[model samples]
Target: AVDMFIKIGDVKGESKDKTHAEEIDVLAWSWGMSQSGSMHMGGGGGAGKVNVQDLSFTKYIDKSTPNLMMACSSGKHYPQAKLTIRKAGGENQVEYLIITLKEVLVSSVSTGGSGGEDRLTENVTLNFAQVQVDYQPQKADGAKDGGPVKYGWNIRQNVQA
Candidate 1:
């Protein structure tokens, strides 16, 4: 069976009692071919651009939690942080999708709104520099999992031309 159960945390290399979250938007994967990375070298030099390429992604989470506070004070260079997410997926066994974000900055926080409980809950904003994803498959009935397939990309790891 498949489940939408997901969680996020403030660190990586996990195996912890993580906090649950919803409305996770981890996307923006694209081949960056803008005016700068593509044709802005010295005018639209088409032939000379037979070279570099780049990948990009954007992510954010919306959930009610107070654990991600204080880091949102918006300080020196945004005060780098790391976050990890685990998503449950399985057909008839145990499997997981792990996402890790690093060099993260607490972009902002939204607080207070009318609700059923009337409790002041807050939202979080995280702007990250890198994201890595890993798919851990089920270990099998009499053996261990083959391994995990990982796909990762980071702005800092972009090739400079």
Candidate 2:
């Protein structure tokens, strides 16, 4: 029940030399179910596998729904990323998503080399909605530090520079 359009933007990554890291940002866009907390629902992503915790979604289905929230109840995190879906001979829709996640699988190492060949990584589902979901992690205000935050996901002012 989840699908979306994609437009992977800039991704900040690590370099190696004096820079210490490279920017591996990605601009992705998608559309699908507002959230997946029902029975038999899975999560996905693009680029590298991502994990999500404290699952939640915005007030999409019902305004008086009091913000939908679901999880394994063990306080577990699910995978949230870009993904493709097909059901009962239905058309497939690629999308950027943010499903509940737990952990990620990383497989990259350095051995002092120029660079081998870039590889094609798998894509997974992500919640690319323009709205804020139910639950989110907490962090301190950064505007005082020259950065920006929405103040506990307040969902009002712009946080992006």
lDDT of every predicted structure (CA atoms): 0.42, 0.24
lDDT for model 1: 0.42
Candidate 1 wrongly placed segments (more than 4 Å): 1-69, 76-95, 118-120, 139-145, 159-161
Task: List TM-score per model, in order.
Answer: 0.45, 0.18
lDDT value, candidate 2, whole model:
0.24
Cα displacement (angstroms), candidate 2, residue 85, comes to 23
Off by over 4 Å in 2: 1-24, 34-75, 78-117, 126-161
lDDT (Cα, tens digit) per residue for candidate 2, span 10-29: 22232221211232222232
* Candidate with the greatest TM-score versus the true structure: 1
How many collisions per candidate? Answer: 0, 58
As a whole number from 0 to 100, the lDDT of residue 102 in candidate 1 is 56
lDDT of 1 by residue, 48-96 (tens): 3222232233333233233444555743233333333333332333436
